[PDB]
Design a protein around this nucleic acid. Structure first.
Ligand code: ZN
Ligand code: ZN
Ligand code: ZN
Ligand code: ZN
Lengths: 79, 77
DNA sequence: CATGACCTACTGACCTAG
DNA sequence: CTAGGTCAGTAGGTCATG
């Protein structure tokens, strides 16, 4: 309840279902808002930690969904 | 006689006429009090249920009025 | 130009006067 | 009964930095 279940950074609370950090939060939010398809240049299992979370987006996105981060809870843009 | 007619959630009775949950009741109370006008980013046809009632505020406010929810049943501050 | 560290609004479950 | 009310927790920001 104190760590980001995706990259191991300090959590700021539950976001879209799972305890995560501000970096992983905005990442998911930025993807579904714009509907972004990601390709992994590796074997679809790149490690995701605090230091190399931005190495492979694809696996960082998949790691969010395997941890239960809901696409549905991402509201639409405002104003 | 216990289902919210707007989003299918559990209903606590009549709120401004129509059977609705506390979430949709509070949303309608705040939409007239502040006179908030909404715009939709899609084709004004978003699905309104328990899981994405917070997705589009435009379609959620539209489904309220279409379900019979009355604007005059809201008292002033 | 995709990041993320800062910042507010908006929920809705849980209260009480008529 | 259905009108009111709050406020912690999760949503929405924006914008300088690489
Ligand atoms: Zn993270
Ligand atoms: Zn990868
Ligand atoms: Zn409802
Ligand atoms: Zn919409």
């Amino acid at each position: 309840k104190h760590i980001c279940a995706i990259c191991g950074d300090r959590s700021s609370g539950k976001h879209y279902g799972v305890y995560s950090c501000e970096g992983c939060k905005g990442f998911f939010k930025r993807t579904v808002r714009k509907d972004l398809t990601y390709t992994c240049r590796d074997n679809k299992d790149c490690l995701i930690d605090k230091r190399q979370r931005n190495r492979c987006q694809y696996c960082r996105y998949q790691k969010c969904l395997a941890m239960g981060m809901k696409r549905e809870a991402v509201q639409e843009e405002r104003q």
